[PDB]
């Protein structure tokens, strides 16, 4: 008998660990819009998304008083209606710049000591590639909040297509903590546990059989193992049929799958 197997033509690549966070898209430069007097809002000369310049009149009161923009940028929010009464500490609207986007997140103290300015992240607002963006850590707050045990971390989105990372949006963040580089990646099920050790099966094409090689699992995630040991680029390693195999088992190579990408999982 010859056991049926599928084998992968294994490649060297990158597998990357990450910390899973939540955060918000914000901007570095923004300001609240306050009246200079007390009274009722007569007119609102702004809508969401509108561009306004420093000094420009954005609303009007009856005690006629003008409410003016304090900086130049875009209206991110309006928190007041025509009719409402207001004073110099009523926040009417928010203006901010769209060219100084930032992602804000809060990281637990135990992870902070390995995070550095320049670390890579992926910012996700959705499942598809058009909804994911690259970013880099820009700043680490000196403040530890004692109740939550978290420290604020700021990321700057880079690359192309940032016009869909909209200010105010919720995001998932994948903050890359370690990259295993130039290692053999293979589907996790290739690895088999015998007598408290780990092995894979390498196919010898000439003799149509397998050899049981010991390996070490360096890291694994998303059903992918990065391993070290006696395995090299282009070895044929069994990825279906392995539970039935032993050292020297004879097999039938039913098919050969391509190796997993050399590039990072994330």
Automatic annotation (TrEMBL):
Gene3D superfamilies: 2.40.30.170, 2.40.420.20, 2.40.50.100
Signal sequence range: none
Domain of life according to the entry: Bacteria
InterPro entries in alphabetical order: Beta-barrel_RND_2 (IPR058792), MdtA-like_BSH (IPR058625), RND_pump_MFP (IPR006143), Single_hybrid_motif (IPR011053)
Domain CusB-like beta-barrel: 107-177
GO molecular function, one term: efflux transmembrane transporter activity
UniProt domain Multidrug resistance protein MdtA-like barrel-sandwich hybrid: residue ranges: 30-88
GO cellular component: efflux pump complex
Residue stretches spanning the membrane: none
Pfam short name (any one): BSH_RND
Family: Belongs to the membrane fusion protein (MFP) (TC 8.A.1) family.
Name by which UniProt lists this protein: Membrane fusion protein
Organism in which the protein naturally occurs: Borreliella burgdorferi (strain ATCC 35210 / DSM 4680 / CIP 102532 / B31) (Borrelia burgdorferi)
